[PDB]
Amino acid sequence: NLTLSDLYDKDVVYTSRPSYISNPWLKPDEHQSNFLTGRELLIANQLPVIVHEASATDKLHQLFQVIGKEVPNSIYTFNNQQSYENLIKQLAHKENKKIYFQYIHDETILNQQYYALDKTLFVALNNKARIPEWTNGKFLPKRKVVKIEQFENEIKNWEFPLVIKPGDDLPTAGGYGVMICYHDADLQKAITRIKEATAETNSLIIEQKIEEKANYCVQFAYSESLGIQYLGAATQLTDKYGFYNGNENTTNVPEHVIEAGRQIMENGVNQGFFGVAGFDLLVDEDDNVYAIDLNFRQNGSTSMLLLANELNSGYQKFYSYHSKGDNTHFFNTILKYVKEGSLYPLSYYDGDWYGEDKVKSRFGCIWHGDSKETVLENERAFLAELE
Numbered sequence: 001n002l003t004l005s006d007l008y009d010k011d012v013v014y015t016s017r018p019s020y021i022s023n024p025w026l027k028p029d030e031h032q033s034n035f036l037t038g039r040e041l042l043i044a045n046q047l048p049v050i051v052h053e054a055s056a057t058d059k060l061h062q063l064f065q066v067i068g069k070e071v072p073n074s075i076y077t078f079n080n081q082q083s084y085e086n087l088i089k090q091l092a093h094k095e096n097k098k099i100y101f102q103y104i105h106d107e108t109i110l111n112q113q114y115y116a117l118d119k120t121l122f123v124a125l126n127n128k129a130r131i132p133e134w135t136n137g138k139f140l141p142k143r144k145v146v147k148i149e150q151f152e153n154e155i156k157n158w159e160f161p162l163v164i165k166p167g168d169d170l171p172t173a174g175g176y177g178v179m180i181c182y183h184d185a186d187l188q189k190a191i192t193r194i195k196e197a198t199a200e201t202n203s204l205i206i207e208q209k210i211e212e213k214a215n216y217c218v219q220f221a222y223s224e225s226l227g228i229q230y231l232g233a234a235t236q237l238t239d240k241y242g243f244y245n246g247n248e249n250t251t252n253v254p255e256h257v258i259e260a261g262r263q264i265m266e267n268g269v270n271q272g273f274f275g276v277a278g279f280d281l282l283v284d285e286d287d288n289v290y291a292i293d294l295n296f297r298q299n300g301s302t303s304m305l306l307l308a309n310e311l312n313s314g315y316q317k318f319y320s321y322h323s324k325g326d327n328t329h330f331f332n333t334i335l336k337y338v339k340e341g342s343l344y345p346l347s348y349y350d351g352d353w354y355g356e357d358k359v360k361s362r363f364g365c366i367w368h369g370d371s372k373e374t375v376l377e378n379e380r381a382f383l384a385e386l387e
């Protein structure tokens, strides 16, 4: 029954929001970024979280009250960019807090000395170009990191399918900075996107696209008293282009998959890492393991695994949904399904904070039931009532 406050010091404050200053490889909707601020609320425990006002309205309290939870009293709210950045500065300077960023912000928002985890180390651990440095040089697909001036001549040497990823120090997540190419038409689109991002891109990772049979996020935790602890694994729900939609629970993770992730966790810990980490480990048809993405931080599958004690173990689906336009029907359909027992609410972004149906409401949840077929029928019926 681990919680995040077990892993971070008493002076740490947490923000899971992307900065209002985006980069071409992490450009989620402003409302998607605000919706993310409340994702880890149920596992934060004593860790204070910076949350958009619309992410902690009475709508969230109602959904939590059904599952017998409260909205944590230790939240700091913001409602725009200026108050968000001012809050972060005031917390570090006046409250003498240390800020844990899921995604780094620029130094003019907060100097690196106020980061809860060493910024240089955090950036290096979460740098996709530097993955082989953390895997003892194993588990990676056929890959090469090339400077952007050599990308055109190098890409011609590769067969489809392939993946192109930024190879610099910019934050990325959720599939916002991955270009999976299955044919020349995909590559043509990727080349244009790279060209429009010339200002922020100095190098590119070229990687063979693995024909995976499984896609795990294998999670671990570390603190000086706990040691290195395996948290479990989740299957990733990502579309054909790597865009992240959610997670499913797992039943029998192979031993060598867990051990590949643990060795990576040990390498990070030996460099000073602490907290939660999650590693994307693919498995092909011949049972080879591929480390394609290291997340030395929490992510979405962390809530699923840390809340496993409250969920049906037969089948779980972590997912997010948008309002179809009518936020009132959206919320009331959700609240109805939460009371039916097989829908665990995690986060709610109340679009009616901006006025009646002016912004789409957003809902993060875990479907959980005895069988996959019964769970998916429950989700399909929920989606039908939303039209």
Ligand SMILES: Nc1ncnc2c1ncn2[C@@H]1O[C@H](COP(=O)(O)OP(=O)(O)O)[C@@H](O)[C@H]1O
Pocket (backbone or CB within 6 Å): 141, 163, 172, 173, 174, 175, 176, 177, 178, 207, 208, 209, 210, 211, 212, 215, 236, 238, 241, 242, 243, 280, 282, 292, 293
């Ligand atoms: N080399 C690869 N082979 C096969 N699939 C890949 C590869 N790289 C990425 N993907 C797919 O794209 C998704 C997102 O890419 P990832 O490197 O995890 O970026 P992010 O930082 O957005 O999670 C993965 O979950 C996986 O489904």
Ligand SMILES: [Mg+2]
Pocket (backbone or CB within 6 Å): 280, 293
């Ligand atoms: Mg990933």
Ligand code: NA
Pocket (backbone or CB within 6 Å): 172, 173, 174, 293, 294, 295
């Ligand atoms: Na990631």
Ligand code: NA
Pocket (backbone or CB within 6 Å): 215, 236, 237, 238, 239, 240
């Ligand atoms: Na996928």
Ligand code: NA
Pocket (backbone or CB within 6 Å): 126, 172, 293, 294, 295, 296
């Ligand atoms: Na990552």
